[PDB]
């Protein structure tokens, strides 16, 4: 039947093709990798990163490449994302897959349908091509991801990862505090909290409205994070955070004070003299109850924390934006909005009568 050798071959070949594609990409615009790698640096500290000079001059060896705009960088990053998905799949199936009389036996059947007049130049060309849209040069996107659209992932106010839109959450927040004493900027001042978010909470951490809000917000920040950095392994990050959550807490709440001792995150909101009473409190009916009811919230809070930390640059960038727009005039604010809009909707790569029939009769 089907000779596995051929299948495994085609697999290794396709993998090669993909590696070559995303490598060509990383070649034309090194930023693609650089950008990614930099972020990775602050998540997995071990990661080795290139010489700063290379990053700045946007070069990989000798040639300094033209700087690209954000929308394109992100685009290609999501494209490379799907490519890496394909690759991972093929690698998988491959792992799960890996005489003379028969030679003449098959060579005989190869004589079948001799009259097959047709030119066949479409195996490596259709693949090479499948991973490299327009007639000649209009759309950077490969045939592989021809229906890939960033605007369906990023809103206009996010500007492909430049900012994160928190106005909406300012609204919900007003709805949560049941007043209006809170301004967009004071709300951002609140977000900055995220020990502070634990010991100086905006609201009581056992309040319903508050916990719900925090959930929604957390989810948003996380999706935004992975959305803006396709190239980094999402599962890796997730698991890292989860293990930090489980392992850091258990011995001492990871939060320790020389005066009050050991604090409990989310469920109890109490300190403890020594580690001893802390441990014998983690089996008590109280802590069982709380850790059994407020688990999801505590975990979500934590995620909001670490993801906001990983996005400090974006948080600052946006807060800045806010203050700017705020200090604009009418015309200024309008023109700025025009700009954000244009950036949003721009190509990622630039080149009878009755009165007459009655009268006539």
């Amino acid at each position: 039947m089907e000779t596995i050798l051929e299948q495994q071959r085609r697999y290794h070949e396709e993998k090669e093709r993909l590696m070559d594609v995303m490598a060509k990409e990383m070649l034309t615009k090194k930023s693609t990798l650089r950008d990614q790698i930099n972020s990775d640096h602050r998540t997995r500290a071990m990661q080795d990163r290139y010489m700063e000079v290379s990053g700045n001059l946007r070069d990989l060896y000798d040639d300094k490449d033209g700087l690209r705009k954000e929308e394109l960088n992100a685009i290609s990053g999501p494209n490379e994302f799907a490519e890496f998905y394909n690759r991972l799949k093929q690698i998988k199936e491959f792992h799960r897959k890996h005489f003379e009389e028969l030679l003449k036996a098959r060579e005989n059947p190869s004589e079948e349908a001799q009259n097959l007049v047709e030119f066949t130049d479409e195996e490596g060309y259709g693949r090479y091509l499948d991973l490299h849209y327009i007639n000649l040069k209009a759309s950077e996107k490969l045939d592989y991801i021809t229906y890939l659209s960033i605007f369906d992932q990023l809103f206009d106010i996010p500007k492909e990862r430049k900012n994160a839109e928190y106005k909406r959450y300012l609204e919900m927040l007003l709805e949560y505090l049941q007043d209006y004493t809170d301004r967009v900027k004071p709300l951002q001042d609140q977000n900055e909290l995220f020990e502070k978010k634990w010991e100086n909470g905006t609201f009581p951490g056992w309040p319903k409205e508050t916990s719900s809000a925090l959930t929604h917000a957390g989810a948003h920040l996380d999706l935004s994070a992975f959305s803006s950095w396709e190239e980094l392994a999402s599962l890796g990050l997730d698991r890292l955070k989860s293990a930090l959550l489980a392992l850091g807490l258990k011995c001492g709440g990871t939060l320790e004070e020389r005066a009050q001792r050991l604090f409990s995150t989310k469920g109890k909101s109490l300190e403890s003299l020594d580690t001893s009473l802390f441990a014998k409190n983690p089996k008590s009916k109280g802590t069982k109850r709380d850790t059994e009811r407020n688990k999801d919230i505590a975990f979500l809070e934590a995620q909001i924390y670490e993801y906001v930390e990983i996005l400090g640059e974006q948080r600052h960038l946006t807060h800045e934006n806010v203050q700017r727009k705020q200090a604009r005039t009418g015309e200024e604010r309008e023109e700025e909005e025009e700009e954000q809009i244009s950036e949003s909707e721009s190509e990622d790569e630039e080149n009878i009568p009755y009165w007459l029939y009655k009268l006539h009769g």
Partner: protein, 162 residues
């Protein structure tokens, strides 16, 4: 002529004669089944007749797909996770394809709603005990090759292969 998103978007779309939403993918010389995501799970039937597909595999999760007409292709193997991407597959027409060994039909045992199966004009058909083998290994089938699976055949297939 890759089965592409663009290909699916210009393809004749209509309500067929048995009142189901069907997509027409006939005669395009498609070799590999792929990119079905773009149909958006909006079809009850998909007609892949007269193409060059080798393996019935590569489907996304399609909850509404109930009928697959795959006449005159080159199907020689059936993918293993078919129920996970096609849970309500009820009718599978494979007439005039290339399935040669009884064991190659084994993956159809996992299609829990499969009730109408047609494998005529496949070499596998002439294998000894082909009908009883299908009946015992794919008991959910009620009509096989346009003939009613009867009780006596079920019992007979229970002896052999018990």
């Amino acid at each position: 002529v890759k089965l592409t998103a663009e290909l699916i978007e210009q393809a004749a779309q209509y309500t067929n004669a048995v009142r189901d939403r069907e997509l027409d993918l006939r005669g395009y010389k498609i070799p590999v089944i792929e990119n079905l995501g773009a149909t958006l799970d909006q079809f009850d039937a998909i007609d892949f007749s007269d193409n060059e597909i080798r393996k019935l595999d590569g489907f996304p999760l399609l909850r509404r797909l109930k009928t697959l007409l795959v006449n005159n292709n080159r199907i020689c193997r059936i993918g293993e996770g078919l129920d996970q991407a096609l849970p309500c597959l009820t009718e599978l027409i494979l007439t005039n394809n290339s399935l040669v060994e009884l064991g190659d039909l084994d993956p159809l045992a996992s299609l829990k709603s499969l009730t109408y199966l047609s494998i005529l004009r496949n070499p596998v058909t002439n294998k000894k005990h082909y009908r009883l083998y299908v009946i015992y290994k794919v008991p959910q089938v009620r009509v096989l090759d346009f003939q009613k699976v009867k009780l006596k055949e079920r019992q007979e297939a229970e002896k052999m292969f018990k």
